[PDB]
Design an enzyme around this catalytic site. Structure first.
Site, PDB file in Angstrom:
ATOM      1  N   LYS A 121      50.194  17.766 -14.989  1.00 21.32           N
ATOM      2  CA  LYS A 121      51.386  16.967 -15.236  1.00 21.32           C
ATOM      3  C   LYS A 121      51.079  15.811 -16.186  1.00 21.32           C
ATOM      4  CE  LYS A 121      55.089  14.425 -12.825  1.00 21.32           C
ATOM      5  NZ  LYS A 121      55.745  14.133 -11.505  1.00 21.32           N
ATOM      6  N   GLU A 165      39.059  16.213 -12.996  1.00 18.37           N
ATOM      7  CA  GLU A 165      38.598  17.564 -12.699  1.00 18.37           C
ATOM      8  C   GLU A 165      39.105  18.597 -13.707  1.00 18.37           C
ATOM      9  OE1 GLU A 165      39.088  15.691  -8.430  1.00 18.37           O
ATOM     10  OE2 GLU A 165      40.266  15.645 -10.284  1.00 18.37           O
ATOM     11  N   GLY A 170      54.218  17.171  -8.160  1.00 16.73           N
ATOM     12  CA  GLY A 170      53.158  18.153  -8.252  1.00 16.73           C
ATOM     13  C   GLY A 170      53.198  19.198  -7.149  1.00 16.73           C
ATOM     14  N   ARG A 171      53.328  18.756  -5.896  1.00 21.24           N
ATOM     15  CA  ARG A 171      53.355  19.680  -4.764  1.00 21.24           C
ATOM     16  C   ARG A 171      54.674  20.445  -4.663  1.00 21.24           C
ATOM     17  NH1 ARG A 171      53.001  14.545  -3.365  1.00 21.24           N
ATOM     18  NH2 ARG A 171      54.755  13.476  -2.337  1.00 21.24           N
ATOM     19  N   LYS A 194      42.277   9.344  -7.668  1.00 23.26           N
ATOM     20  CA  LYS A 194      41.978   9.700  -9.053  1.00 23.26           C
ATOM     21  C   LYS A 194      41.326   8.557  -9.833  1.00 23.26           C
ATOM     22  CE  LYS A 194      45.959  12.785  -9.319  1.00 23.26           C
ATOM     23  NZ  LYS A 194      47.209  13.114 -10.070  1.00 23.26           N
ATOM     24  N   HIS A 223      41.431  35.819  18.047  1.00 25.36           N
ATOM     25  CA  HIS A 223      40.043  36.019  18.443  1.00 25.36           C
ATOM     26  C   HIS A 223      39.202  34.800  18.099  1.00 25.36           C
ATOM     27  CE1 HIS A 223      40.850  40.509  18.546  1.00 25.36           C
ATOM     28  NE2 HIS A 223      41.856  40.042  17.830  1.00 25.36           N
ATOM     29  N   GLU A 267      50.764  15.542   2.241  1.00 21.66           N
ATOM     30  CA  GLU A 267      50.808  14.647   1.091  1.00 21.66           C
ATOM     31  C   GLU A 267      52.184  13.976   1.004  1.00 21.66           C
ATOM     32  OE1 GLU A 267      49.527  14.718  -3.680  1.00 21.66           O
ATOM     33  OE2 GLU A 267      49.984  16.586  -2.629  1.00 21.66           O
TER      34      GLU A 267
END
Ligand SMILES: O=C(NO)[C@@H](O)[C@H](O)[C@H](O)COP(=O)(O)O
Ligand SMILES: O=C(NO)[C@@H](O)[C@H](O)[C@H](O)COP(=O)(O)O
Lengths: 556, 556
Positions: free
Chosen positions: A210, A216, A271-272, A518, A388, A357
């Site tokens: 964005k 990263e 973003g999400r 960030k 299990h 978030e």
């Protein structure tokens, strides 16, 4: 905080602290055989049915009415309209929240800053469609004239998880599409292992960001380009192997990507909540644009359901209020998401981000600190595997854990004449039945006696085989997991998250903690270089850094 | 109830009741420069170092003293020796608990209700190595005389997660070995998409089942054999493509696998503690037997550390008691595991099972119903990713969440001259520093004031930009993620889980909830056949079943 001062919340609170302790699921069903009918919702989208069965919840008609009255007095509807109308409800960043515009198939105008945003949304969509067409048909050629066989999406967080989860969930619909890869972690292992399997001549990299400044992603992007040019040898070739999905034309330019190769979105696209935008380019490339438009339509259908249905019959509202009930009245810290579908193996992880978030906040829109719980910790894994493993704790632990069980009626792989899916469905049904029913001391001892256990063995083993039950669950069953149904399901949860945020009076669309993250590594990064010890931080950070420099040498 | 009656436990609660709320991490560091040295431990394994820094926890000298006092009054040490000595501490099942025997490379005797188990333990190991040598060298041939290129492990729960998590973590050591696949879900999608990539001629299946009666595993195994035979024939050839890992010799034979190709383990080998046994065959096949022995050696070192180290400096015990502190005194429902390593992407999921299936109990070994909380909910995703997602809630939510941050000093892929790993380390360090320190109103105010904000906007934004901090974490740093170190890390957590169970006086080695599940859907499975409505269960279960029957053949 607004919630605590609300009279509807107080009435519900008082009722719970007066009867809550007394609500037994097994008893409720045994005294009301219209329970399923009264606490279940069926949705016919004309493209498959979605049954939301919330009858196995610790609620009664009295409880539901009080919960919906709370949704009303907390202004959920008005807030809903403000969002759909493009108002800047993201108060801290002063932005609109318009992911619903991205999938607004009806093209109804949505005004922001005195301009309908739909024309721009459709322009990008058309550009995405034209590009995917070129790539898929083989018209788009690499720097050596070869067609593109691999698409690599480089991005993190909201620019990664959505497309990863959706392409995984929709694998059955990706015939005639190139292979898709997702690189996200800065950890070098991620990009290195991916590059090792690629041919630069037939690989197309998609840089999703964005802001186009995330450390990263930009670092991974540079490594990818460096790797590429080790072969290409002409920066004029990167234009044939690198494209960008961003809102920052400036930065994309500086990286070495000319426009026309930039697919943009806007600041009102969280973003999400961005897979519905240009961020979904990898999705469209994988399953085709028609399927991508189906995904959008499914979301649009759910958006309309949320906007036009009376609260009492509104899926995301009911899901949200039952959650408020467990979170603020029963004090449950978590929410489990258990899809009985392997293709949805990243579904829980996706909403772990989406929910946490969004609602992991403690300051209301009025600036007041909350004096009540907000967002829960969301987790889960695709069943049956869980049965299990961690199901042991859900059945016999000391924690109340609301669980959402999801499953499609029809499978994408009816192998063995449907035997595998038959077993899968039976387990889906039996698990919520057992969580509800449990197994009394009398029932357990009966089995132990029939097993021929000595009075000694039965006595010491009996307590351990008892199940108290009364553990609430939601069962969400849909006809089939198609691009459309998936879209509606994702939209359903997005709105559940929205409703809870409104009830808690928090801003579910900012992420100051994420923004902070960030910018944290910044100071320590340069201090790691030298071999001299660090002493500028607290002793722990110092000690960890010094242990780091010391073992950097270690030859194991 | 038993812990409730313990005086040390009462002492702890009284202290915390009126003090365990003023404990402020930032304050503790700014008043003790030796905090890091006093609240951390460095373990030299001779094959790499492991630094456990627990200084960022809400504890003081006093607290650690009281926590260690509780450990001894609850008989941790006595309980430990009993486990290592072969005593049947798995009371409810009157079975020994000896996963430590599996990796007891010192070969020291451990008599089990008769003879020493090591001779049999080492016998399987030798057989395992022998088999691997044959498959990896090309000796073992497919019915068409081809070399094995793909190994598919079929199992669920303990017969699946361990080998999957380890082979993923140790991928850099898989040179020369065949590809490994893991099928576990009964959901037909799992086996279907896995077999679609294989060649019957060069594929070897490993049926992993302790009992060899688990519906999921047995069914997938039968479907696998089917896929194989419609490409060949003569049920005899199966012997060249199917092998088993079980304790049920007979029933493994009536399937089609001669006891010749059966690698057994024993009842004192819990599923969630079995990757060290024959269950680990896929691991040995993927990274070689020397690496597998390194893995076992790693766990063996940690076992000895746990057995011979004074509690105050005992890694597993320190981790356990810190957990008890947060669970029983602070009431934290969850425990987050955040490895900063892409290779460890299934690590958190592994212990989600290991921890929860072990300690998700409510009945003591004396038969009393617990008077307190037990096993937390375990969850997590690799770093840095989570920083862009659920970390928002860790930093600014309304829940206290103990976090274990893990990371290797040396990366397996030092690309770009270590730039990626340097950035990864910086985030690892900065995140725990931030969770502890936070950012006061004053600090945030000064930043906004400098930023140019006006009293109006600054005020509006301020509280939202404040981080209360005081979020506790453990930082576990090791030289490099090698087979040996991975083994030591896994064993460390197994013992942490062991210690907590003893303190709570529960049985961390049975799973009656998991046992119940493997018999729950059997009554519903047959009822799903046909189109007639079901009315035999509660209205919810009835309703769901009927919706499935109605939609199963709905054409979408
Ligand atoms: O806002 C977020 N989630 O909603 C974050 O998860 C962002 O999506 C993530 O940090 C990537 O940011 P960029 O796309 O600018 O690189
Ligand atoms: O006991 C368990 N975990 O510890 C369970 O997770 C078992 O491992 C799982 O049910 C597989 O059982 P079988 O190996 O007999 O097929």
């Amino acid at each position: 905080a607004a919630l605590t001062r609300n009279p509807q919340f107080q009435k519900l609170q008082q009722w719970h602290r007066e009867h809550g302790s007394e609500l037994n699921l097994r008893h409720l069903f045994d005294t009301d055989k219209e329970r399923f009918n009264h606490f279940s919702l069926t949705l016919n989208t004309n493209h498959g049915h979605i049954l939301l069965d919330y009858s196995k919840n610790l609620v009664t008609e009295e409880v539901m009415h009080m919960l919906l009255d709370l949704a009303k007095s907390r202004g959920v509807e008005a807030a809903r309209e403000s969002m759909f109308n493009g108002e800047k409800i993201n108060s801290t960043e002063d932005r609109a929240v318009l992911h619903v515009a991205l999938r607004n198939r009806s093209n109804t105008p949505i005004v922001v800053d005195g301009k309908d945003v739909m024309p721009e949304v459709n322009k990008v969509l058309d550009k995405m469609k034209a590009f995917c067409q070129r790539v898929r048909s083989g018209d788009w050629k690499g720097y050596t004239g070869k067609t593109i066989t691999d698409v690599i999406n480089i991005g993190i967080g909201g620019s990664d998880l959505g497309p990863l989860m959706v392409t995984e969930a929709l694998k059955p619909y990706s015939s005639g599409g190139p292979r898709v890869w997702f690189v996200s972690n800065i950890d070098g292992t991620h990009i290195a292992k991916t590059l090792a399997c690629l041919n630069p001549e037939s690989s197309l990299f998609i840089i999703a960001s964005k802001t186009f400044t995330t450390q990263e992603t930009i670092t991974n992007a540079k490594t990818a380009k460096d790797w590429f040019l080790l072969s290409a040898k002409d920066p004029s070739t990167v234009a044939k192997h690198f494209v960008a999905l961003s809102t920052n034309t400036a930065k994309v330019k500086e990286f070495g990507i000319d426009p026309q190769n930039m697919f943009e979105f806007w600041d009102w696209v969280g973003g999400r909540y961005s897979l519905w935008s240009a961020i979904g380019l990898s999705i469209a490339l994988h399953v085709g644009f028609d399927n991508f438009e189906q995904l959008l339509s499914g979301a649009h259908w759910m958006d309309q359901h949320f906007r036009t249905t009376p609260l009492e019959k509104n899926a995301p509202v009911l899901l949200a209020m039952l959650g408020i009930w467990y979170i603020n009245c029963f004090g449950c810290e978590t929410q489990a998401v258990l899809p009985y579908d392997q293709y949805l193996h990243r579904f829980a992880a996706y909403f772990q981000q989406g929910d946490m978030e969004s609602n992991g906040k403690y300051i209301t829109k009025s600036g007041a600190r909350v004096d009540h719980q907000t967002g829960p910790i969301v987790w889960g894994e695709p069943g049956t595997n869980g049965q299990h493993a961690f199901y042991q704790l859900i059945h016999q632990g000391t924690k109340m854990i609301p669980c959402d069980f999801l499953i499609p009626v029809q499978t994408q792989h009816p192998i063995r004449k449907g035997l595998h899916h038959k077993i899968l469905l039976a387990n889906f049904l039996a698990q919520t039945e057992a969580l509800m029913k449990g197994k009394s001391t009398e029932e357990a001892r009966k089995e132990l006696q029939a097993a021929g256990k000595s009075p000694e063995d039965l006595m010491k083993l009996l307590p351990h085989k008892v199940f108290e039950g009364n553990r609430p669950t939601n069962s969400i069953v849909f006809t089939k997991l198609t691009p459309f149904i998936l879209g509606a399901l994702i939209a359903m949860y997005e709105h559940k998250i929205f409703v809870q945020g409104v009830v808690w009076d928090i801003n579910s669309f900012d992420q100051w903690g994420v923004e902070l993250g960030k910018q944290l590594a910044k100071k320590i990064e340069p201090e790691l270089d030298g071999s001299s010890p660090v002493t500028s931080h607290d002793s722990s950070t110092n000690g960890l850094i010094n242990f780091i420099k010391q073992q950097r040498e270690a030859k194991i």
